[PDB]
């Protein structure tokens, strides 16, 4: 159906991507000649890709449709590092907001995991509040919060872990407190609730996750999480 029309948005945007990747590529392998990067004329293309992913607010429809086609996801995964921190945060927020539905349409293709790396790097430019918002969004709070579909998914589960992890980095360097502790009591709770079998296989399991859960759970249940996630 409209998959046909959306496919056009993708190709239109894909062409922009290759152009941007071409300049970056040829510039990165010529770091002698010691010449300043000429980005003045390239910049309006990045915004164009962002617009094509959303297009001012606008409903999640435009973006979600794109994130259902195999090429769409692979594309977005490559567009991310070109976007500004805000643009990428919007994409990540919008992804988590509709993640349950995106996992369903990714049943056959299973290409979501290629977004993990791009999002990983994004999280290191995000402050405490943003991480909480992302987790709060992923878990569906404020609205009825569930994550079952998320934990039973490689990317969903791996994303949850990278978020909780980054949140540890920033919460250790010490309504955020209420927001964060709720998202942490929901995280640990739902993590203990899920059966060992239904849990997906995480791509990269962060080391500081033991310390994090040490703050919201007792020794007894903490061991459960260790054996539960190969925590390290």
Domain locations along the chain: 1-232
Please indicate the experimental technique that yielded this structure: X-ray
Complete DSSP assignment for the chain? -THHHHHHHHHHHHHHHHHHHHHHHHHHT---S------TTTHHHHHHHHHHHS-----THHHHHHTTSHHHHHHHHHHGGGS-HHHHHHHHHHHHHTHHHHHHTTTTT--GGGGHHHHHHHGGG--HHHHHHHHHHHTT-SSS---HHHHTSHHHHHHHHHHHHHHHHHHH---HHHHHHHHHHHHHHHHHHS-TTT----S---TTHHHHHTTTS-HHHHHHHHHHHT--
Stated in angstroms to one decimal place, the resolution of this structure is 3.0
Cβ proximity of 201 and 156 under 8 Å: no
């Amino acid at each position: 159906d409209k998959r046909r029309k959306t496919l056009v948005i993708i190709e239109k945007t894909y062409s922009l991507l290759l152009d941007v990747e071409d300049y970056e590529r040829r510039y990165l392998l010529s770091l002698e000649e010691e010449r300043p990067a000429l980005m003045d004329d390239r910049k309006h293309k990045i915004c164009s890709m962002y617009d094509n992913l959303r297009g001012k607010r606008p409903s999640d429809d435009h973006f979600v449709q794109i994130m259902c086609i195999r090429k769409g996801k692979r594309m977005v995964a490559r567009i991310l590092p070109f976007l500004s921190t805000e643009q990428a945060a919007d994409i990540l927020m919008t992804t988590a907001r509709n993640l349950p539905f995106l996992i369903k349409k990714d049943a056959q293709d299973e290409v979501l995991p290629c977004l993990l790396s791009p999002f990983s790097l994004l999280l290191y430019h995000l402050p405490s509040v943003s991480i909480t918002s992302l987790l709060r969004q992923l878990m569906n709070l404020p609205g009825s919060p569930h994550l079952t579909a998320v934990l039973q998914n490689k990317f969903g589960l791996s994303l949850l872990l990278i978020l909780l992890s980054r949140g540890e980095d920033l919460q250790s360097s010490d309504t955020q407190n209420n927001q964060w502790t709720e998202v942490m009591f929901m995280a640990t709770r739902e993590l203990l609730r899920i059966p060992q079998a239904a849990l997906a296989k995480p791509i990269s399991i962060p080391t500081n996750l033991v310390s994090l859960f040490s703050r919201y759970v007792d020794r007894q249940k903490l061991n459960l999480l260790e054996t539960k996630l190969q925590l390290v």
